[PDB]
Each structure stands twice: as structure tokens, then as C-alpha cells.
């Protein structure tokens, strides 16, 4: 088993398609557990200004009682057989997955059929949930990471649905009524926009039979989004009482398509990640992280690759004190243009290995495998096998990384979002000047 | 605001405008702000009819 043989030995993801348009897919294994869930193409990207937050609201209400299962009775099932019911709604995806035993798949799918089709939307339950969402919004206000990322989205995609947050404004939260929720679920939770993923010890034919027996009476056989526009801007929520200063700087990246994602991830793998409670410290190959550990510039930093259907954000997010924002902006831009102008071969090899490890280790356990299945059948349109990922990483070299970074980084207007004691944060002109090198 | 990205170019524009005015003076009316009597050898035996500074 020389790695490549191990990659070939990974079982494939069989994909089917119901008459209603449900893309039933499954990956068979030998584990005695399973994770089955539907991924829907709803989210804030498909939400208008007045509807903003309806997806989060309906996701909240989904588990709190159905039509056939009144209230906690549904929950009474999930705990009775040891299942873990969970959900998450991204800006472009929504999902409700139920961890269960391999022998509980016939029931679990049934529960899923109840959650997405025969929902309740009880008015009194809506009233109880409204204040809960308000308090959750207040809790997220203290989340200086999520707040900064929402600031980045708003200041990068201003004037487009992508700028909208997942939870939506509090005004919409209090305004939203049952009619809007049922209209939203009837318009977005359509069969062609749903994929019933199931990883673990589930046989694909059994999954197909269950889906045909439960998800049959869905929609027959329309929000298709609008191409959003990137607008290099900046938001400075100067608040000196905050202890640290979260900064996020991004550029218009690629989408789920546009294979340039694979080299680009490698570049991010070169920059890497670091925080105070790390290991080697002033020895890690990342020059950014090594310098940060040497001079203690920050408490954290990361490189994200948020990519949507047609566009996406590529950049970094660092958490540091008030007296070191300028230095880390300098070093981060220096690393970006070092990769842009002369990426070398050894760093590219290290990035390839890091990306290989990320993809391989991320896809362990039934939950990440099922999530990958559901997300890939929506974004890529196909569950990309790990062998294809290996080949695509292998094709990446120094010249490819330099070219792709030049395409996406060099002389590009970034979007900046700072929160906290960000007085040191250089003005947007200085950042944009850092986005190009005079020597080169 | 940082001095560099804004006030360097602002002072560059100001310097260009001052250069424009100074060059107008030098190239078109060099002796506009100058007494013609200065173009005469300094004779200590004869005062100018009018004596004034610059
Ligand atoms: C000429 C073309 C450029 C060239 O040959 O070398 C560019 C090269 C700078 O390359 P770079 O990629 O912009 O450097 C980025 C670094 O991070 C270093 O810059 P930084 O990130 O620390 O700060 C960003 C920015 C900060 O802005 C400045 O430093 C202002 C530069 C002067 C502006 C005019 C007002 C102040 C005087 O730096 C500069 O603008 C570079 C200043 C030095 C070069 C220009 C000197 C002009 C003198 C007149 O210049 C030098 O290294 C200096 C010597 C050669 C140029 C002067 C002769
Ligand atoms: C006279 C020329 C310098 C003054 C006017 C230009 C200026 O102040 O800045 C622009 C220029 C380019 O460099 P800049 O983008 O400021 O910083 C380096 C890249 N991060 O800064 C310069 O210094 C440009 C001239 C030298 C190259």
C-alpha cells in the first residue's frame, strides 16, 4: 500500500437521481454507524432584503416539531435510538444530518422526510423562537471572529445578496411572519435543489428505496441567484475597549469551479496558520508564522478560502494587539508577494503535502464524508474522488503557483474588515500600495 | 491619516503650482518685481532719484 494504492482502495460514492430530481448519493463502508442528511441549496445568498434571515428561522423551526410528529415527539425519537440530529445553514447551503446506527437508517430517513417536507411552522413556536434568535444574535455580536467575517462579506459584496448575513438583521427577525417562512420553504426546499447524502454503513440500494418511499411526494420535476460583484472596500469598527483587534483582508478568489482553486489552496498552505499556543513556534516553515512567533506580533492568524458558486474570498485573518497591526499587514503582504513573484519549488512541495494531508485527514469519520458528499454534489456537481484531488495537486508546480497568485493577488484591490483597537491599521491606500511591488 | 499616501502627493501638487508661478515670473517678466535702477554700476557719487528696498 504505497499511498496511491490506498487512494484507489477508497470506496466510491454511488450517485442516483429520483424522478423528483432528488440526487440520492451514498458511500458504502463497513462501520456500524452512519450519517444521513439532506443538503438543500437554500441560504442567505438566495434571500432578498425583506426575506433576509428566513432561512435561519426555518432551520431553527425545523427540529421543533413537525406535522406528523408533534413537537418534542420528533426529538423523542432522535434521542430514543441514540441518533444525533444536527443542522447548519451557510450563506449558500443548508443541511440537516442525523447521526445514527446502521440499523436505524430506515427510521432516520423517515425523520428527515418529516423535517424538510411536513414542517410545522407553529405560530406560538415562532413567537418563542423569535426572542431566542434575538438572544443568539446578541451572543454572536460578542463573537469577534464571526462579526469580522460578516463585516468582510458586507464590505466586499456590498449591494449584492452575498453581503447579507446568515441570521439577517434584527429588524427582519422581528418582522418575519409565518407566511414568509412557509413561502420560503415552499420556494427554496425544492426537490431538484436537494441532495440526500448518506455516509457510513448504508447500502446505496437501501438508501434509494428509502428515498423513493419517503421523499417521493416532493416538488415536481425560481431563485437562481445573480452574479455578485466584488467591491474592494474597507470597514473600520474602531472600538478601543476591545482587548484585541481582529483584521480580515481578502481578494476576489475563484469559485467552486475554476480549478485554479487547487493551486491557490497550495499557496494558502504555504502561508499556513499560527496562534500563541502552538508547537515549534519560531521554527515552522511559514515565514509569516516564524516571524510572528519570533516577535510575538499576534495571538492568531489564518488563511481562508471562502469560495462561492461564481466568486469567492481569498485572504487572511489575524488577531493581534493594537500595537502590531501595521507590522503584520507588512509581513502578510510581503509573504503574498514573495509567493507571487518567486515561489520556489521546495515551498510548493511543502504546500502540496500540507494540502494532501488536509484533504485526506478532513475526510475521516462519517460526518465529514457525508458533508463532503452533500456539498460536492451541490457545488461541483460530482463527488470528486480523492485520486482526482491527488492528480490535481500533483500537477501544481512553482510556475503554476506563481501564475495563479499573480492572477489573483498582484495589483488587486482588497477588501478589509477591522474590528477593535484598529487605529494602527494602515489606511486603504497603504494597503493597496502593499498590493504591488516596485522592485518587480 | 498617514502622511505618505496623501500629503506627499498634495505637497507635490502644491510644489508644481508654485513652480508654475515662479517659472512664469522667470521666463516672461523676469524683472517684474525688480527695480530697473539695479542694472547700473554702483556709483557712490550719484544717488538714485528714488531709493527703495525690494
Ligand atoms: C525606481 C523604481 C523602484 C526601484 O527601483 O526600487 C523600488 C524599491 C522598493 O521596492 P518595493 O517593492 O516598493 O518595497 C516594498 C518594501 O516593503 C519596502 O516598503 P515598505 O513596505 O516598508 O513601505 C511601503 C512604501 C512606503 O512609502 C515610502 O516609503 C515613501 C517613498 C517616498 C515617497 C516620497 C515622499 C517621501 C520622501 O515604501 C516605498 O514607497 C518605498 C520607498 C523606497 C523607494 C522609493 C524612494 C523614493 C525617494 C525619493 O526601492 C528601494 O528599495 C529603494 C532604493 C531604490 C529606489 C530609489 C532609487
Ligand atoms: C516623486 C515620486 C514620489 C512621490 C509620489 C508617489 C508617492 O508618494 O508614492 C507612490 C510611489 C510608489 O510607492 P508606494 O506605492 O507609495 O509604496 C511602495 C509600494 N507598496 O512612491 C514612490 O516613492 C515612487 C517613486 C520612487 C519609486
Per-residue DSSP letters for A300-321? EEEEE--B-SS-BEEEEEEEE-
A430 touches chain B (CB under 8 A): yes
Q: Test B1 with A427 for CB contact under 8 angstroms.
A: yes
A426 touches chain B (CB under 8 A): yes
Q: What is the CB-side half-sphere exposure of residue A384 using CA atoms within 13 A?
A: 21
- Closest to A368 (Cα-Cα) out of A162, A115, A86: A86
The whole-angstrom separation of Cα A230 and Cα A413 is: 9
The whole-angstrom separation of Cα A413 and Cα A436 is: 10
What residues does A419 pair with on adjacent strands? A237, A246
Q: What is the CB-side half-sphere exposure of residue A274 using CA atoms within 13 A?
A: 27
Cβ A421 under 6 angstroms from ligand 2: no
Of A433, A435, A440, the residue with max ligand 2 atoms within 8 A of its CB, to mutate for a pocket test, comes to A433
The whole-angstrom separation of Cα A385 and Cα A362 is: 14
Cβ A410 under 6 angstroms from ligand 1: no
* Resolution as reported, in Å: 3.5
C-alpha cell at position A179 = 407566511
Other beta carbons within 10 angstroms of residue A143's beta carbon come to 12
The whole-angstrom separation of Cα A230 and Cα A251 is: 8
What radius of gyration, in Å, describes the C-alpha atoms of chain A?
23
Cβ A224 under 6 angstroms from ligand 2: no
The whole-angstrom separation of Cα A26 and Cα B52 is: 102
Mutate to test the interface with B, among A429, A431, A432, A438 (most CBs of B within 10 A): A429
C-alpha cell at position A264 = 491557490
Q: What CA–CA distances, in Å, run from A313 to A59, A373, A412?
A: 25, 23, 12
Q: Which residues of A are catalytic?
A: 59
Determine the distance separating the centroid of ligand 2 and the alpha carbon of A409, expressed in angstroms.
Answer: 20
The whole-angstrom separation of Cα A405 and Cα A407 is: 5
C-alpha cell at position A424 = 494602527
**Beta strand A194-200 with A25-28: parallel, antiparallel or unpaired?**
parallel
Q: What CA–CA distances, in Å, run from A408 to A201, A254, A255, A337?
A: 42, 8, 12, 11
Q: What CA–CA distances, in Å, run from A41 to A86, A87, A153, A327, A371?
A: 17, 14, 19, 41, 13
- Closest to A75 (Cα-Cα) out of A94, A105, A98: A98
Instruction: List strands edge to edge, sheet with A313-320.
Output: A234-238, A415-420, A245-252, A313-320, A298-304, A274-275
B6 touches chain A (CB under 8 A): yes
Q: What CA–CA distances, in Å, run from A200 to A22, A102, A386, A391, B48?
A: 20, 8, 17, 26, 111
DSSP class of residue A283 equals T
- Closest to A116 (Cα-Cα) out of A6, A28, A214: A214
Cβ-based neighbours of A338, under 8 Å, separated by 6 or more:
A287
Angle at CA A139, nearest 5°, toward A133 and A140?
Answer: 90
C-alpha cell at position A298 = 499576534
Q: What CA–CA distances, in Å, run from A71 to A86, A122, A206?
A: 16, 10, 29
Report the gap between the CA of B5 and the closest CA in chain A (Å). 6
- Closest to A360 (Cα-Cα) out of A405, A335, A409, A393: A393
Residue A16 burial by Cβ neighbours in a 10 Å radius (0-12, 13-18, 19+): middle
Q: Is A247 helix (H, G, I), strand (E, B) or coil?
A: strand
- Closest to A168 (Cα-Cα) out of A185, A184, A150, A186: A150
The whole-angstrom separation of Cα A292 and Cα A113 is: 50
Angle at CA A367, nearest 5°, toward A353 and A182?
Answer: 125
A427 touches chain B (CB under 8 A): yes
C-alpha cell at position A367 = 460526518
Chain B partners within 8 Å of A429 (Cβ) = 2, 5-6
- Closest to A250 (Cα-Cα) out of A319, A156, A146: A156
Are the CB atoms for A37 and A97 separated by under 8 Å? yes
DSSP class of residue A411 equals T
- Closest to A216 (Cα-Cα) out of A313, A109, A303, A298: A109
The whole-angstrom separation of Cα A309 and Cα A287 is: 32
Ramachandran angles phi, psi of A263, nearest 5°: -60, -40
Determine the distance separating the centroid of ligand 2 and the alpha carbon of A293, expressed in angstroms.
Answer: 31
Q: What CA–CA distances, in Å, run from A292 to A77, A224, A266, A304, A320?
A: 50, 44, 21, 18, 10
Amino acid at each position: 500500500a504505497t499511498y496511491a494504492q490506498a487512494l484507489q482502495s477508497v470506496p466510491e460514492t454511488q450517485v442516483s437521481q429520483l424522478d423528483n430530481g432528488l440526487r440520492v448519493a451514498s458511500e458504502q463502508s463497513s462501520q456500524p454507524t452512519c450519517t444521513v442528511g439532506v443538503w438543500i441549496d437554500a441560504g442567505s445568498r438566495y434571500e432578498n432584503e425583506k426575506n433576509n434571515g428566513a432561512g435561519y428561522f426555518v432551520e431553527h423551526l425545523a427540529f421543533k416539531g413537525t406535522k406528523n410528529r408533534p413537537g418534542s415527539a420528533l426529538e423523542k425519537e432522535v434521542e430514543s435510538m441514540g441518533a444525533h440530529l444536527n443542522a447548519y445553514s451557510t450563506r449558500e447551503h443548508t443541511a440537516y444530518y442525523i447521526k445514527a446506527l446502521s440499523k436505524d437508517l430506515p427510521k432516520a430517513v423517515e425523520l428527515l422526510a418529516d423535517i424538510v417536507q411536513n414542517c410545522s411552522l407553529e405560530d406560538s413556536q415562532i413567537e418563542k423562537e423569535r426572542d431566542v434568535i434575538l438572544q443568539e444574535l446578541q451572543e454572536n455580536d460578542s463573537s469577534m471572529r464571526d462579526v469580522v467575517f460578516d463585516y468582510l462579506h458586507a464590505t466586499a459584496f456590498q449591494g449584492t445578496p452575498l453581503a447579507q448575513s446568515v441570521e439577517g438583521p434584527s429588524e427582519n427577525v422581528r418582522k418575519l411572519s409565518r407566511a414568509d417562512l412557509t413561502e420560503y420553504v415552499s420556494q427554496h426546499y425544492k426537490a431538484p435543489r436537494m441532495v440526500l447524502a448518506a455516509a457510513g454503513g448504508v447500502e446505496h440500494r437501501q438508501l434509494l428505496d428509502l428515498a423513493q418511499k419517503h421523499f417521493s411526494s416532493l416538488s415536481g420535476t425560481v431563485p437562481a441567484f445573480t452574479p455578485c460583484r466584488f467591491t474592494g472596500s474597507e470597514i473600520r469598527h474602531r472600538d478601543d475597549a476591545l482587548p484585541l483587534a481582529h483584521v480580515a483582508i481578502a481578494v476576489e478568489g475563484p469559485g467552486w469551479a475554476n480549478p485554479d482553486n487547487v493551486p491557490l489552496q497550495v499557496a494558502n498552505a504555504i502561508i499556513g496558520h499560527y496562534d500563541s499556543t502552538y508547537g515549534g513556534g519560531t521554527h515552522m516553515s511559514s515565514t509569516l508564522a516564524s516571524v510572528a512567533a519570533t516577535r510575538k506580533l499576534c495571538q492568531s492568524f489564518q488563511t481562508f478560502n471562502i469560495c462561492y458558486a461564481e466568486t469567492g474570498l481569498l485572504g487572511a485573518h489575524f488577531v493581534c494587539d493594537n500595537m502590531s497591526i501595521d507590522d503584520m499587514m507588512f509581513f502578510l503582504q510581503g509573504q503574498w508577494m514573495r509567493l507571487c513573484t518567486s515561489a520556489t519549488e521546495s515551498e510548493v512541495v511543502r504546500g502540496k503535502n500540507i494540502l494532501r494531508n488536509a484533504l485526506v485527514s478532513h475526510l475521516d469519520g462519517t460526518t465529514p464524508v457525508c458533508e463532503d458528499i452533500g456539498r460536492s454534489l451541490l457545488t461541483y456537481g460530482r463527488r470528486i474522488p480523492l485520486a482526482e484531488w491527488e492528480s490535481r495537486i500533483a500537477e501544481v508546480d512553482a510556475s503554476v503557483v506563481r501564475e495563479v497568485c499573480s492572477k489573483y493577488f498582484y495589483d488587486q484591490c482588497p477588501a478589509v474588515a477591522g474590528l477593535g483597537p484598529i487605529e494602527q491599521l494602515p489606511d486603504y491606500n497603504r494597503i493597496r500600495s502593499g498590493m504591488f511591488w516596485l522592485r518587480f | 491619516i498617514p502622511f505618505h499616501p496623501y500629503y506627499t502627493i498634495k505637497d507635490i501638487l502644491g510644489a508644481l503650482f508654485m513652480m508654475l508661478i515662479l517659472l512664469i515670473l522667470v521666463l516672461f517678466s523676469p524683472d517684474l518685481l525688480g527695480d530697473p535702477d539695479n542694472y547700473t554700476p554702483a556709483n557712490p557719487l550719484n544717488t538714485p532719484p528714488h531709493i527703495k528696498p525690494e
